Amino acid sequence: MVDLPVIQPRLCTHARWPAPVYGLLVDPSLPSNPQWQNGRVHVDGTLLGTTPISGSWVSCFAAEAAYKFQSGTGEVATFTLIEQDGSAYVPGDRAAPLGYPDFSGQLEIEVQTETTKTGDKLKVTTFEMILGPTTNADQAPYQGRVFASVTAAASLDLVDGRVRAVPRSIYGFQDTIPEYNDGLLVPLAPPIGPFLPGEVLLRFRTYMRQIDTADAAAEAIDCALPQEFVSWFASNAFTVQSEALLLRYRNTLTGQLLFECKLYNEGYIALSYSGSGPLTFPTDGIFEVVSWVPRLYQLASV
Amino acid sequence: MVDLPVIQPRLCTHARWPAPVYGLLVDPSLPSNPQWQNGRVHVDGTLLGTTPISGSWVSCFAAEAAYKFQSGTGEVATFTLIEQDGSAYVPGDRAAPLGYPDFSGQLEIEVQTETTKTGDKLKVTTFEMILGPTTNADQAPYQGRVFASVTAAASLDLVDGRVRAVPRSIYGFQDTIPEYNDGLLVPLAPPIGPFLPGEVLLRFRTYMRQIDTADAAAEAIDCALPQEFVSWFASNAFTVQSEALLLRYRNTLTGQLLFECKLYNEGYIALSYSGSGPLTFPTDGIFEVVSWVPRLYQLASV
Amino acid sequence: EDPVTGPEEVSGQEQGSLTVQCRYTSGWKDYKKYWCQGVPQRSCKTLVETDASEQLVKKNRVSIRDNQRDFIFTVTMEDLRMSDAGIYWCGITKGGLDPMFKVTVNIGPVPT
Amino acid sequence: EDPVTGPEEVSGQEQGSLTVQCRYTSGWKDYKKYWCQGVPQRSCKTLVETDASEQLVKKNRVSIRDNQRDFIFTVTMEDLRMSDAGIYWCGITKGGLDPMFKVTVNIGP
Ligand SMILES: C[C@H](CCC(=O)NCC(=O)O)[C@H]1CC[C@H]2[C@@H]3[C@H](O)C[C@@H]4C[C@H](O)CC[C@]4(C)[C@H]3CC[C@]12C
Ligand SMILES: C[C@H](CCC(=O)NCC(=O)O)[C@H]1CC[C@H]2[C@@H]3[C@H](O)C[C@@H]4C[C@H](O)CC[C@]4(C)[C@H]3CC[C@]12C
Ligand SMILES: [Mg+2]
Ligand SMILES: [Mg+2]
Ligand SMILES: [Mg+2]
Ligand SMILES: [Mg+2]
Ligand SMILES: [Mg+2]
Ligand SMILES: [Mg+2]
Numbered sequence: 001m002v003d004l005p006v007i008q009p010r011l012c013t014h015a016r017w018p019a020p021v022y023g024l025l026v027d028p029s030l031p032s033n034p035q036w037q038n039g040r041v042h043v044d045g046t047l048l049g050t051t052p053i054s055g056s057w058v059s060c061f062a063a064e065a066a067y068k069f070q071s072g073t074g075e076v077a078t079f080t081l082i083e084q085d086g087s088a089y090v091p092g093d094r095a096a097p098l099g100y101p102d103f104s105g106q107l108e109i110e111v112q113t114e115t116t117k118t119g120d121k122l123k124v125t126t127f128e129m130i131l132g133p134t135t136n137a138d139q140a141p142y143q144g145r146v147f148a149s150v151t152a153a154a155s156l157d158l159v160d161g162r163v164r165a166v167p168r169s170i171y172g173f174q175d176t177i178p179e180y181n182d183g184l185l186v187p188l189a190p191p192i193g194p195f196l197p198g199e200v201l202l203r204f205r206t207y208m209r210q211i212d213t214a215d216a217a218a219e220a221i222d223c224a225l226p227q228e229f230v231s232w233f234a235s236n237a238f239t240v241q242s243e244a245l246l247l248r249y250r251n252t253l254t255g256q257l258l259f260e261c262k263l264y265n266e267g268y269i270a271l272s273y274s275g276s277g278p279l280t281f282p283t284d285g286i287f288e289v290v291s292w293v294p295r296l297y298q299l300a301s302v
Numbered sequence: 303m304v305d306l307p308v309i310q311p312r313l314c315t316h317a318r319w320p321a322p323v324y325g326l327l328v329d330p331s332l333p334s335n336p337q338w339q340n341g342r343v344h345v346d347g348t349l350l351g352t353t354p355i356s357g358s359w360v361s362c363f364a365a366e367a368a369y370k371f372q373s374g375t376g377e378v379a380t381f382t383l384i385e386q387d388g389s390a391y392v393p394g395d396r397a398a399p400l401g402y403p404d405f406s407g408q409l410e411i412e413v414q415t416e417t418t419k420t421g422d423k424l425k426v427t428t429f430e431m432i433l434g435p436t437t438n439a440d441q442a443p444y445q446g447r448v449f450a451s452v453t454a455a456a457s458l459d460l461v462d463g464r465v466r467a468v469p470r471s472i473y474g475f476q477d478t479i480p481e482y483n484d485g486l487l488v489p490l491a492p493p494i495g496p497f498l499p500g501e502v503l504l505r506f507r508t509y510m511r512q513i514d515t516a517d518a519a520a521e522a523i524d525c526a527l528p529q530e531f532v533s534w535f536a537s538n539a540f541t542v543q544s545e546a547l548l549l550r551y552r553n554t555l556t557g558q559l560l561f562e563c564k565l566y567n568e569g570y571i572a573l574s575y576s577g578s579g580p581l582t583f584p585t586d587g588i589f590e591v592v593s594w595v596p597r598l599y600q601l602a603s604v
Numbered sequence: 605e606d607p608v609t610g611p612e613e614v615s616g617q618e619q620g621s622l623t624v625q626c627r628y629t630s631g632w633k634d635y636k637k638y639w640c641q642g643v644p645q646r647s648c649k650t651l652v653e654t655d656a657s658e659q660l661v662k663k664n665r666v667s668i669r670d671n672q673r674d675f676i677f678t679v680t681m682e683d684l685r686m687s688d689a690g691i692y693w694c695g696i697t698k699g700g701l702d703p704m705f706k707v708t709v710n711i712g713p714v715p716t
Numbered sequence: 717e718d719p720v721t722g723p724e725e726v727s728g729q730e731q732g733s734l735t736v737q738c739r740y741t742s743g744w745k746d747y748k749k750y751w752c753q754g755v756p757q758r759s760c761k762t763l764v765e766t767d768a769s770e771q772l773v774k775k776n777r778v779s780i781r782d783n784q785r786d787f788i789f790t791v792t793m794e795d796l797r798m799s800d801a802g803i804y805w806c807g808i809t810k811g812g813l814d815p816m817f818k819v820t821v822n823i824g825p
Contacts (some may be wrong), residue, residue: 216423
């Protein structure tokens, strides 16, 4: 028994930003070997990087929040990070708590805040948090500490306590790992790869809620596998027999074959594509496992 | 034969509010037979109510948004609803588009908005939207039409277009179905049940981001199955051989049995519990399938 | 200008009465008016509603009458109780989001 | 009260220069000061930074000098190009969130 969940891409959950999958494509123009830390799983069930089981952990974090007002900046939150199930975060062999963002830019986050001001007790406060690539904020989620702030003329009278932070929007998105440890290197899942000559990465794409003062173009973010596949492998714990799995992407109502591809053991899909521009595929198909294959198995082009 | 994902509840996704599963309990004081529309699936893979596959669809919707300013109300959004994958929504055999909230209260939603105003273009706006139980807003998601608003002194100069609305907070939550069709009846998945005498519903609990002016108590919302079980069944499409599945909930690090329960074909779990007060359980166990049983198999009390 | 306005806060006393005047712009003359209770705003419990005429309506201890000449509908609450305190709304019925105005109602005891 | 304040907007014309005075409170005397460029705010491009002394620093077309008796550090930008218009920041280097003040730079031809 080695199979995939019978779920169309358009109905799947994205693995690096909590939103549906909207696109399926290959693009030789983009980095062929991204070092994404979320949405990384071995076919045998081993989660890699900061990949979580649940899509609700993706691009989120939990923490003990301590708030302090700073003239000239506003209300400042010092988040002491926890794993999103409440278990203690211990700096170890990964970049950050499971699900922490693995991209850069300025992130609007939202947390439950209790206030002491009269007439309101519970509200949701939007903070700004700089992720990367480089920052003067000295973010160190690897060490379990990050800083956010919200513009405030005076104290918001917030009560310190535990929080779960979820992303509201991205500002100046860059698909490059954030500042995990004040600019120092941390344990990272390796760059996705390798690929045979003529093979390129299959990309599951969604789009992120964006702040952009000039450009209305949507912000894309790709992942190697949808979150359904991540938990599917984590739960099944398959025995791996070869370097990759031969898959066929089909429309089951027609049976028409859209393309064949190789799902490497290490959790990415490669298509043989010699074109130069992006090639988008329909998202209403199903991935079908055919057999185990060796690394040098040559795919048919598309 | 039916099997289940080897995932601990504390690592699963809640199926009615997009957030982690934090609690696992029974509570006789709560309604024994709720009419939840999400988190409803048949063991043979049949989705019930408005249940979607992806957890990112839970308590969200997609729409063609049209904005008109109303003096005394602010910016008013008329959402012509779409299925969250872009497929045209057609009134049919369920209460609303897939994933639409199945509870009541006043919901803050976030959508991508585009403005024509100088100095900015894309931003994320929070709207207030009344769900139910009854409203004067004439909400009719069954017909693909709902209304929301954000208080404002003048037009925000928003550009009509497509949106994905995600939930920010709940105000005045009530675990009763919302206004699906301006007070009229709509097709609904039946209440959860029935149960044997002495059997009660197993609840997977998360807590919702809340606006509350007086009370700091968290707002619990329960569901019958984690989203991982929903997708697991929809994908596998098992063959059902009796009325229910006998399950054991163990700590697999110890083999300690925490309780036995019955997963009925119609998508809900029952425990034998005679107490009157609530009883919570560890969230780090695993559900294991034992065998098919009749609807009359009497469980060991807890 | 706003379509319907009234007093932000009123205070009545036990066994007493209150009168609330909801002023509205002429465009809403031929719409139904009503008086609502509770929060959230748009799931509030309607206590009395007109039929878009000027006929007076009374239900329990609440009455409403629309003066479509001066564009004011008047609400009266009689035999006030402590339990009557809370948030209320002047309302104009229409398709979709109704024009509404928040009216906080305080009730206290007659001092001794 | 605010740890650092400067001009909200400043202007110069192409090929000219401009000066920016970043006033700060006395406690930040012995901290590095810097002049940053671009948004997002806290990932901006540092153009020049001091060594916490009064020594003037010059890098490309930008210089910074900290006057620690009056508690002002002065920034100059020379040979102004239209490409220099945008968002800049008076900065003070410290652990965590740096004290920063937004300065908008405009360029006329
Ligand atoms: C106050 C919030 C509930 C409201 C909220 O902030 N978010 C709910 C949502 O995602 O919509 C509570 C409810 C349960 C809490 C979490 C759980 O207790 C588990 C865990 C416990 C740790 O002590 C702190 C983090 C962490 C993960 C908690 C964070 C805060 C939570 C989430
Ligand atoms: C502008 C937004 C992107 C930002 C956003 O609003 N949400 C992304 C997030 O969850 O962070 C675009 C990107 C893709 C768009 C969706 C897709 O095109 C699919 C679908 C297509 C329908 O024509 C309109 C609704 C619907 C569902 C679209 C809604 C708006 C989307 C989501
Ligand atoms: Mg640093
Ligand atoms: Mg942009
Ligand atoms: Mg109605
Ligand atoms: Mg509450
Ligand atoms: Mg209405
Ligand atoms: Mg710093």
